Amino acid sequence: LSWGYREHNGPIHWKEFFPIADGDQQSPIEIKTKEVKYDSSLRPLSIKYDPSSAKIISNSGHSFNVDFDDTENKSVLRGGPLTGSYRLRQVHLHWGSADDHGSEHIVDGVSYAAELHVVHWNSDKYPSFVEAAHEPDGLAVLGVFLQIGEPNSQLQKITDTLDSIKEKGKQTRFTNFDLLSLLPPSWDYWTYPGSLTVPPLLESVTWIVLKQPINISSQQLAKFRSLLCTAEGEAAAFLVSNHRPPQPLKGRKVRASFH
Numbered sequence: 131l132s133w134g135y136r137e138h139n140g141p142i143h144w145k146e147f148f149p150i151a152d153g154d155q156q157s158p159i160e161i162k163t164k165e166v167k168y169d170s171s172l173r174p175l176s177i178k179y180d181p182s183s184a185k186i187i188s189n190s191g192h193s194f195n196v197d198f199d200d201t202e203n204k205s206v207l208r209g210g211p212l213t214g215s216y217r218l219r220q221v222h223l224h225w226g227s228a229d230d231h232g233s234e235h236i237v238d239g240v241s242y243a244a245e246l247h248v249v250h251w252n253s254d255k256y257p258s259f260v261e262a263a264h265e266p267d268g269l270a271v272l273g274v275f276l277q278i279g280e281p282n283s284q285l286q287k288i289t290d291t292l293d294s295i296k297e298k299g300k301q302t303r304f305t306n307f308d309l310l311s312l313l314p315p316s317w318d319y320w321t322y323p324g325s326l327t328v329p330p331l332l333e334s335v336t337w338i339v340l341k342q343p344i345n346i347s348s349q350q351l352a353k354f355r356s357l358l359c360t361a362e363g364e365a366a367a368f369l370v371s372n373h374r375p376p377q378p379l380k381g382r383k384v385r386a387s388f389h
């Protein structure tokens with residue numbers, strides 16, 4: 131298949147080849163903080179990310195992905211709303227065509243400039259990410275909002291690479307990536323049950339979205355828009371926007387770890 135974010139193949143078109151697009155636990159959503167319920171039973175996040183787990187950065191045509199070696203248990207998320215160990219798999223980012231929008235999740239009617247997703251899978255129960263992606267408790271994604279601010283020394287590692295992966299399919303070695311340090315200093319979070327925000331749109335994600343944004347400069351974020359959604363030797367299209375609109379909550383509870 132050949133989904134994307136352009137006029138012919140974008141989010142409104144996804145339902146055509148992925149009927150779960152209209153499902154009851156679709157992501158992303160609006161977080162309306164006046165409707166969030168603090169839940170004292172939610173636990174703190176327990177995070178370990180080995181900077182040597184990071185292997186490769188590539189252009190999928192839908193974002194950049196930092197792939198981590200997920201055959202080993204070096205990089206694991208536990209706690210939060212999660213039962214068991216969730217192995218780190220991959221990091222990517224969503225943004226919009228300009229800095230005033232671009233996050234997937236929206237807070238109190240407001241879009242951030244971009245949103246970082248840290249993809250993990252239940253390695254207690256499932257033999258691989260591919261099997262875990264089909265189960266309600268299979269995935270956990272940590273979301274971090276990016277707002278325009280000062281230049282981010284931690285994102286600069288990624289931005290420095292983006293020219294070498296400008297075309298879809300291109301990849302480049304990427305390691306010693308201190309992912310933890312990219313996180314905001316508060317790990318307070320909202321959580322709800324949801325889906326992949328991209329086709330196949332599987333309802334297998336425990337969303338964990340951190341309240342506190344991190345900064346990125348205008349010039350840093352603009353580098354992501356210089357990525358192509360098209361391959362070398364193909365007609366060019368810039369990956370100007372790669373975010374899905376908020377989906378109906380359909381009676382799900384968004385809970386907060388904090389008050």
Ligand SMILES: Cc1cc(C)nc(SCC(=O)c2ccc(S(N)(=O)=O)c(Cl)c2)n1
Nearest residue numbers: 220247249260263271325326327328330
């Ligand atoms: C073999 C295989 C299967 C699947 C379901 N995805 C992939 S690559 C896509 C991928 O890992 C991915 C992309 C986007 C998201 S999101 N925006 O965080 O909900 C997630 Cl959870 C996974 N590969």
Ligand SMILES: [Zn+2]
Nearest residue numbers: 222224247327
């Ligand atoms: Zn994502």
